[PDB]
């Protein structure tokens, strides 16, 4: 049985995220002293981050671009810092380098989008306010602030090449936790559809099946249930604290009853 509709259910949040608060920030915290800005209880179109002016690097490692719309996260962490042009590649899972091993290392299983753009018109002097560590005996733990002298100041100059040019880099750390999600983006929560094989997409909980009324006695902090086979069976709606059963769309085998072709060609299907 093919899906017949496409349901969308996101919490009662309509305010725009302070995306420009950290994306359009006047000052970015140094890469070795990067700030972690937590964004929550808001909805914002990630396309404006995809197609913002003067943007050169918008890659989602562990996410698919334009798929963030249908995915709501409990909390989104905005890590704002400025690095060299050649150092943007180091802000990614599995990458090694000066920034990736001295100042700011992402987890090897990073689930987020690394956003960078050239800022030679704003962060160029040598701009001796941005600093990056240059020496360390080992590699940094993921999301750690570490504070010749290892802490070497950036030589950010307008005459410097695009490799040495200052680039403002923002990291969106998405945490898909079992708690209800709030950073939902541009999603018009559709009507709750019952007795129809529909695609769930409950705050990004991708799936398909039949949604009916549920009688489980959920605890207040629990958002969804599970079966003995570790299969999702019930989901609580983010807006109203109502739980709904999940039944997969019916299927089966098809067999044909036929007599000998030498007699006739009438068939029956079961």
């Amino acid at each position: 049985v093919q899906p017949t509709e496409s349901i969308v259910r996101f919490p009662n949040i309509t305010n725009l995220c302070p995306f420009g608060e950290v994306f359009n920030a006047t000052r970015f915290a140094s890469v070795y002293a990067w700030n972690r800005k937590r964004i929550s209880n808001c909805v914002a179109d990630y396309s404006v981050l995809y197609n913002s002016a003067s943007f050169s690097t918008f890659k989602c490692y562990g996410v698919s671009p334009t798929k963030l719309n249908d995915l709501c996260f409990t909390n989104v962490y905005a890590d704002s810092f400025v690095i060299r042009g050649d150092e943007v590649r180091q802000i990614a899972p599995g990458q090694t380098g000066k920034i990736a091993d001295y100042n700011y290392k992402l987890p090897d299983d990073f689930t987020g989008c690394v956003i960078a753009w050239n800022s030679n018109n704003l962060d160029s002097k040598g701009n001796y306010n941005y600093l990056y560590r240059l020496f360390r005996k080992s590699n940094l733990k993921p999301f750690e602030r570490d504070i010749y002298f290892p802490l070497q100041s950036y030589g950010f100059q307008p005459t410097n090449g695009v490799g040495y040019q200052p680039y403002r880099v923002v990291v969106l750390s998405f945490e898909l936790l079992h708690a209800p999600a709030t950073v939902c983006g541009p999603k018009k929560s559709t009507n709750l559809v019952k007795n129809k094989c529909v695609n769930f997409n409950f705050n990004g909980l991708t799936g398909t099946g039949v949604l009916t009324e549920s009688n489980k006695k959920f605890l207040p902090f629990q958002q969804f249930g599970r079966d003995i086979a570790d299969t999702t069976d019930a989901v609580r709606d983010p807006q109203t604290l109502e739980i709904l059963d999940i039944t997969p769309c019916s299927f089966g085998g098809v067999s044909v009853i036929t007599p000998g072709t030498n007699t006739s060609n009438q068939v029956a299907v079961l």
């Binding site: 079966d227 086979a229 299969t231 997969p248 299927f251």
Partner: peptide, 25 residues
């Protein structure tokens, strides 16, 4: 068989059937 039950089993058959123990997508 006893002609007084929905299933025309015997007493022994009923006992044997009762003495046995009691996803998919």
């Amino acid at each position: 068989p006893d002609p007084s039950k929905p299933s025309k089993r015997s007493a022994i058959e009923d006992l044997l059937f009762n003495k046995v123990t009691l996803q998919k997508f």
